[PDB]
């Protein structure tokens, strides 16, 4: 895809707020595209140590980073050169909401994000906010095609300290500055992972792997 | 090995309920390969007469016994079977609907019977469910979390429009089992139910289903599955 | 409003299943719709000792008792002679789903109804399957007319045994057989109590007041 | 009656944020009598221009120091002023749209000041709110719970539309006080918040509401409140 090289880097800034506490945060990474892989390092330079669980923000820190087939329509190679965005709210089972925006762009070989966050309705006494969640399971995102755009359904499950899991619903737009070609519905394959935490909890290096295609069983309609 | 289930397994289904205002009665007749993970229904609306809201709300009510299953990943529904299980459901769709469903599952011979309950409610009068405007469901992937000795299965599914667009809705299932079973870790299934054949008359629909159950298969730096 | 007389009998049946508990209800009861009183005996006659708690079947357990001013059309006693009916999903903050859909008819000064119910979901180990509920608090319901129907939308709160409270969102839908004259919108301020419960915990006297009013808040714009 | 509340308190609010892709800020002056219930805000739009979405969306989140309380009812937020507080929203449309906020409230001799921070997604595109089809709120009814130290708000609002019908939304917003405060025991709040005055380039929007705190108007059998 125009523009798109093996190896891109990131720069990220992401600025909001969670149950009354107000933070900001940047990150610094890179990955490949067509492989679909990337690596974030992210450093919390407002707010100090988390009241919260970083697990929560960590779906807002790029899905040019996705191995896409020839035969499916790459929506967001296409759309990175004149840019595009996406706005996100994330509902919890037990009460929270995570509403977060974004802005995509790109300069030279940097892929450039600005985040915003607010999560409001947090549990004060649940997993999230008492920090009690170890990392989110791997997921499948239903990609569908809306209106020029892309709307992402998704259930991802996120692992608890007791060894349960506390599980939320996504529902991801996606809008481009330029018009491009839209994919038929399709599934994104993920698994986002932190790899390294600093001891005074500031610095998080974080990882994600993404594989899109289309269902894997067979279709007695000759249905994708 | 599970004795009691054969390579190929008889279904016998009655369905109850109503949907926006209107009561209905369903009976199935079908046919499976319960390792093989597919399945086979032939669907017969007996009381309610042809429906007035879209038949596609009612395909998810109509058996994971039918779903392949590795070595590796211990099989709930299969361990469940002959002891008996139920399942229970939500599915909340994005304009407005909300079906509710309750199902028992118990094993007579190599038949497997299935008890099913729907109550739906709130569906505009308008939109694509209640003016049968849809055209089946999309392929999707459901989340199987071990939950308090028994399962939670999350999906969001995508019903196709005559519009050429979709409408979704969420979907949260519980599952209990009457014997104590070996619990699965968490991992995910594969699904495609498809419609084969849509009587004229309204009266008979034939439904197939292909399943598969496994792990993520993109890589780990953890090391977790 | 025709065959609506100063009290009316109520028979109500009822049939359902709640987290896998399947049960049988029936009601003998009479009140009166002017004063918008009502007083309901309850027999649980299936499903032995019920594993959840009575309040979750409560709301289900007839508009028709509701003190209505001049100024307001009654869509419920309007509806009543040619008969109506409601259906309702309630929604738990903690996960619980109830959903119920109703027969109302008249035959003489005798009020029938035909309830079903089907509840999922709800937390193996939260208050409602734990029977650590006591009564539901007064509410106040916004009735909003809609193409020939109503919809009536309210937040009630559940009194638990530790003293705080569980909440749920009910949205209720109306129809009525005959087309009758549909009012502006308006609310419902309710109070649902249960009054006594036999020894044997099957027998249950439910009462219930509901007044009828537009927002008494003055307005700038000249709007009710 | 209260600590620092004044017969009539004025107001120096902030708003910036963001719905459906475009960012705004709101500057608002005004002015109330905090114990008669009543209050003004003269809203400027400062950046974003003519907002491409509808204003009443952010209505609810241009102060409840403004509300007729009971001498029986602890009024939370007239406690709560001196030393500060702070609210919390989910706003969820019943056609998709979420609008979350968070605010910050203070107390600098009579004038109270707000800090209001607004993220809303999800919004139809074609919706009655992002094409701008709606006309002012209706009056509500507010529960008032008490939780863990602070209080659960849960309503029900009904946004009145251009074609004569209504888009209704769930609205449960948290408060939390700086200093620990007398809680009152559940009750309920009666709102009417209403547009009087709009510039034709939709940059200034003057702001009526007033409220009535009070227990259920129906009698109890078991003696209640």
Same mark, same amino acid.
């Given at each position: @895809?125009?523009?798109?090289?093996?190896?891109?880097?990131?720069?990220?800034?992401?600025?909001?707020?969670?149950?009354?506490?107000?933070?900001?945060?940047? #990150?610094?990474?890179?990955?490949?595209?067509? !492989?679909? &892989?990337? $690596?974030?390092?992210?450093?919390?330079? +407002? #707010?100090?140590?988390?009241?919260?669980?970083?697990?929560?923000?960590?779906?807002?820190?790029?899905?040019? =980073?996705?191995? @896409?087939?020839?035969?499916?329509?790459?929506?967001?190679?296409? $759309?990175?050169?004149?840019? =595009?965005?996406?706005?996100?709210?994330? &509902? @919890? !089972?037990?009460?929270? %909401?995570?509403?977060?925006?974004?802005?995509?762009?790109?300069?030279?070989?940097?892929?450039?994000?600005?985040?915003?966050?607010? #999560?409001? *309705?947090?549990?004060? *006494?649940?997993? %999230?906010?008492?920090?009690?969640?170890?990392?989110? +399971?791997?997921?499948? +995102?239903?990609?569908?095609?809306?209106?020029?755009?892309?709307?992402?359904?998704?259930?991802?499950?996120?692992?608890?300290?007791?060894?349960?899991?506390?599980?939320? =619903?996504?529902?991801? &737009?996606? /809008?481009?500055?330029?018009?491009? /070609?839209?994919?038929?519905?399709?599934?994104?394959?993920?698994?986002? +992972?932190?790899? *390294?935490?600093?001891?005074?909890?500031?610095?998080?290096?974080?990882?994600?792997?993404?594989?899109? $295609? @289309?269902?894997?069983?067979?279709?007695?309609?000759?249905? *994708?």
């Amino acid at each position: @895809y125009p523009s798109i090289k093996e190896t891109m880097r990131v720069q990220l800034s992401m600025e909001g707020s969670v149950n009354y506490h107000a933070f900001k945060c940047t #990150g610094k990474g890179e990955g490949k595209p067509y !492989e679909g &892989t990337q $690596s974030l390092n992210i450093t919390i330079t +407002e #707010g100090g140590p988390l009241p919260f669980a970083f697990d929560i923000l960590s779906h807002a820190f790029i899905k040019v =980073f996705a191995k @896409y087939p020839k035969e499916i329509p790459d929506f967001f190679k296409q $759309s990175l050169p004149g840019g =595009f965005s996406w706005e996100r709210v994330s &509902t @919890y !089972e037990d009460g929270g %909401v995570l509403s977060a925006t974004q802005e995509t762009s790109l300069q030279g070989d940097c892929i450039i994000c600005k985040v915003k966050v607010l #999560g409001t *309705n947090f549990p004060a *006494n649940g997993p %999230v906010m008492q920090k009690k969640t170890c990392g989110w +399971e791997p997921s499948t +995102e239903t990609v569908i095609p809306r209106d020029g755009g892309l709307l992402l359904r998704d259930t991802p499950a996120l692992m608890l300290a007791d060894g349960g899991h506390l599980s939320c =619903f996504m529902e991801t &737009t996606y /809008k481009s500055k330029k018009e491009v /070609k839209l994919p038929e519905l399709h599934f994104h394959h993920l698994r986002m +992972e932190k790899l *390294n935490i600093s001891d005074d909890w500031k610095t998080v290096e974080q990882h994600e792997s993404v594989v899109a $295609s @289309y269902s894997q069983v067979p279709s007695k309609l000759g249905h *994708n």
